[PDB]
Design a protein around this ligand. Structure first.
Ligand code: SF4
Length: 225
């Protein structure tokens, strides 16, 4: 389907059915969006919310986080697993305090230079908190695009990764970028699931190639054996 129809149908779906009341979606800032993205990378939303609230109460600003002892950050992280994320979280807070005056940087290159922040997380921070015109590509988003446009191939091959980034740029609009990027995460998390997707609930069902052929299991490709 035409990219302008993809974006319009996802935005109309988000308006009526999307998630808008998570704590990191209200009175949004770059700091709140970065902290939530790091916690969500390897942990489900229901488990993250109490940790997000405890971190914002103890560390109201990125300078408070930077000046705290690392052992206190690791103690508050206990139960989230994947603690390389917490070691990098503290180093990134120290980089913002030291290079950027305690104010989150607003250019793609300076955000992506932070430890623990790659290409997709950088675009998420700048689009969701300030409305800058960048697309995202985490596992949820990649599954929706690979099924709708029939992208086989393992995304761990560079040519396949590059095709998925170009597709994401093509369907992501500038007007409503914050709504669109959250809506793509909601679709992959709750509707276009790994097993047995809920196509009847999906706003792309009228143009999706996997839905038309009942072939969702082929997309994205798996690692070769
Ligand atoms: S129609 Fe089905 S397979 Fe296609 S993007 Fe939606 S949930 Fe995924």
């Amino acid at each position: 389907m035409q990219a302008s129809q993809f974006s319009a149908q996802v935005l109309d779906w988000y308006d009526k059915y999307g998630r808008k009341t998570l704590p990191w979606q209200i009175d949004k800032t770059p700091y709140k969006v970065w902290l939530s993205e790091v916690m969500l990378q390897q942990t489900q939303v229901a488990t993250v919310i109490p940790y997000f609230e405890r971190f914002m109460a103890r560390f109201p600003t990125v300078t408070d986080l930077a000046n705290a002892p690392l052992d206190e950050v690791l103690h508050l992280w206990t139960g989230l697993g994947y603690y390389a994320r917490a070691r990098n979280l503290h180093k990134a807070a120290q980089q913002v305090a030291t290079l950027h005056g305690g104010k989150f940087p607003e250019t793609f290159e300076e955000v992506a230079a932070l430890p623990g922040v790659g290409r997709s997380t950088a675009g998420a921070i700048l689009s969701l908190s300030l409305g800058k015109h960048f697309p995202i590509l985490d596992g949820n988003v990649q599954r929706v695009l690979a099924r709708c446009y029939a992208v086989s191939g393992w995304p761990g091959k560079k040519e396949v990764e590059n095709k998925l980034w170009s597709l994401s740029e093509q369907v992501t609009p500038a007007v409503g970028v914050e709504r669109f990027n959250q809506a793509m995460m909601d679709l992959g998390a709750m509707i276009c699931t790994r097993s047995k997707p809920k196509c009847s609930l999906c706003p792309l069902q009228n143009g999706c190639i996997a839905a038309a052929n009942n072939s969702w299991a082929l997309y994205p490709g798996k690692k070769p054996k």
